[PDB]
Amino acid sequence: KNEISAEFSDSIADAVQNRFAALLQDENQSKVIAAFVLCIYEGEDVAPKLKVISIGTGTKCISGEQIGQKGETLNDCHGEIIACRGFRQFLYDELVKSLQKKTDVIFKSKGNGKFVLKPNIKVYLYINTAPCGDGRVFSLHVNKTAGMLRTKIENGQGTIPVPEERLRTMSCSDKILKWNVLGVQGALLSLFIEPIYLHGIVVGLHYNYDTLKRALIKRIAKMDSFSQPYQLNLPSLGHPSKIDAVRDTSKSTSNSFNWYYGQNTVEAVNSITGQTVIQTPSRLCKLAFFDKLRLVISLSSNRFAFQTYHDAKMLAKEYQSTKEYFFKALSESLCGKWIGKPYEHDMFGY
């Protein structure tokens, strides 16, 4: 089976609820809430400390219309993706600290140049509702569309199978499946740290163990032929007991909120524009990551030669080759072909 207990899922959901209330001024118009949660063991005999590292909300993404090409526009403002981006920023900040040789850090050195997450720290993903895409498809083991890659529709609201409307965004279920192959950290961070994999995933509304197992973990049921430190991650799946309530009333908001550890402030993003509500680039946009990367580069003792963001990502050779094998495994298993943006979106510099 491999299901988190109700008590522990409620523990995770409770901590997310408490942090959310501490950040947002009394008003709940957010429909999708996600978070990344650290579970920190002091010893393995006592209960762990739970620490909410990032929060995202949102239900929408950009049309090709508003997409910029300076990396100043958020492509995807679904709360789960926004939560991951914030967690990535956290990883960067922690990586800096480790490079400035601080002690209060989640990383230790691995004797290959690259940091590894301390083994007493476990990462959990929480979402108050099943992720869009395959994770909301309920089918028995006997099925057309079950298991397929899906793309987000009409600025986020809805997913449909990949073409088997120009260049679209993959569903949250497919992105989480990807994170369980390549880690949550992305190409760039993998230059400096070993892949960080989710230990567990806690899902509220529309939970079904078998659906989420297929969607997020065991979809290809092949892969293997993996090269350490990459593997098929098998996180446990959990469901909390109570939920804030479905509320499909009227319509969803275009606002997407984010917070992550070490920020004093909640940033509010217009999901239709991919930028802040004061027409500025988000602290989570590609360009903000690219700034962080060079910060990191200057504190590193290595040199890095790349013209663009795109080229920098291609430096992560282990990640990129596992990514390519993953995409092929999906196509071979008849899950469809991944739709990735064209390279020119990432061909910017600074």
Ligand X SMILES: O=P(O)(O)O[C@H]1[C@@H](OP(=O)(O)O)[C@@H](OP(=O)(O)O)[C@@H](OP(=O)(O)O)[C@@H](OP(=O)(O)O)[C@@H]1OP(=O)(O)O
The one-letter code for the residue type at 127 is: I
Q: Which residue is nearest to ligand X (CB)?
A: 340
Q: Which of 78, 214, 219, 313 binds Zn ion (CB under 5 A)?
A: 78
The one-letter code for the residue type at 22 is: A
Convert residues 177-216 into a mask of x (bound to ligand X by CB under 6 A) and - (unbound): ---------xxx----------------------------
The verdict on whether residue 172 carries a ligand-binding annotation is yes
The verdict on whether residue 75 carries a ligand-binding annotation is yes
In 1-61, which residue ranges form alpha helices assigned H by DSSP?
6-23
| Contact positions with Zn ion (CB under 5 A) in 168-227 | 172
Catalytic-residue membership of 44? no
- Give which of 43, 132, 150, 119 is closest to 80, Cα–Cα: 132
* Angle, alpha carbons 144-150-151 (nearest 5°): 145
| Contact positions with Zn ion (CB under 5 A) in 128-167 | 132
135 binds, among Cl ion, ligand X, Zn ion, none (CB under 5 to 8 A by kind): none
DSSP-derived pairing of the beta strands 115-117 and 107-109: antiparallel
CB of 193 to ligand X, least distance (A): 13
16 binds, among ligand X, Cl ion, Zn ion, none (CB under 5 to 8 A by kind): none
In the chain, which residue ranges form alpha helices assigned H by DSSP?
6-23, 79-99, 172-182, 186-189, 209-216, 286-299, 309-314, 317-332
CB of 48 to ligand X, least distance (A): 27
The one-letter code for the residue type at 19 is: R
| Beta carbons within 8 Å of 160's beta carbon, 6+ residues apart | 150, 151, 153
Distance CA 74, CA 281 (A): 8
Tell me how many helices (H) and strands (E) the chain has: 8, 12
User: Taking CB under 6 A as the rule, does residue 269 contact ligand X?
Assistant: no
User: Taking CB under 6 A as the rule, does residue 341 contact ligand X?
Assistant: yes
Binding residues for Zn(2+): 78, 80, 132, 172
Binding residues for 1D-myo-inositol hexakisphosphate: 75, 85, 88, 175, 178, 187, 286, 309, 313, 319, 323, 338, 341
Indicate which residues carry an active-site annotation.
Answer: 80
> Which residues sit at the interface with ligand X, rule CB under 6 A?
75-76, 81, 84-85, 169-170, 175, 186-188, 286, 313, 340-341
